[PDB]
Amino acid sequence: LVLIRMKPDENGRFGFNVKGGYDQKMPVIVSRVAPGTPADLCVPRLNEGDQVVLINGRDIAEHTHDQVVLFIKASCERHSGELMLLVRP
Amino acid sequence: TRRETQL
């Protein structure tokens, strides 16, 4: 497991796509990392296929698709204003 | 099909 933090661009976006959830019965995986985005250019670097376990320190094993999606955009869970992600490549 | 969302 490798931890990855980052911050959104001026439009508050990050530049990666997700899929899965409790509703899709799929683990939550990175679907694509657009180049040039923050998520493309962080160290350690996000990549397609990493499985996410936590977001800002929250176990999402039993959460849905729209629910997770709301978790990321909640720009207030971010300490120092960076979005913390824990993934399992 | 199965929904994927962009962030």
A18 alpha carbon, distance to own chain's centre: 8
According to DSSP, residue A12 is labeled S
Method: X-ray
Q: A27, A62 in Cβ contact below 8 A?
A: no
Count of all residues that appear for chain B in the document: 7
Chain B positions touching A75 (Cβ under 8 A) are none
Q: Is B4 on the interface with A (CB under 8 A)?
A: yes
In this complex, the residue of A14, A15, A65 whose CB is nearest that of residue B3 is A65
Structure tokens at A67: 């629910």
Please state the three-class secondary structure of A24-86 as a single string: CCEEEEEEEECCCCCCCCCCCCCCCCCEEEEECCCECCCCCHHHHHHHHHCCCCCHHHCEEEE
Among all residues of chain A, which has the CA nearest to that of B3?
A19
Which chain A residues touch B3 with a CB distance below 8 Å?
Answer: 19, 24, 65
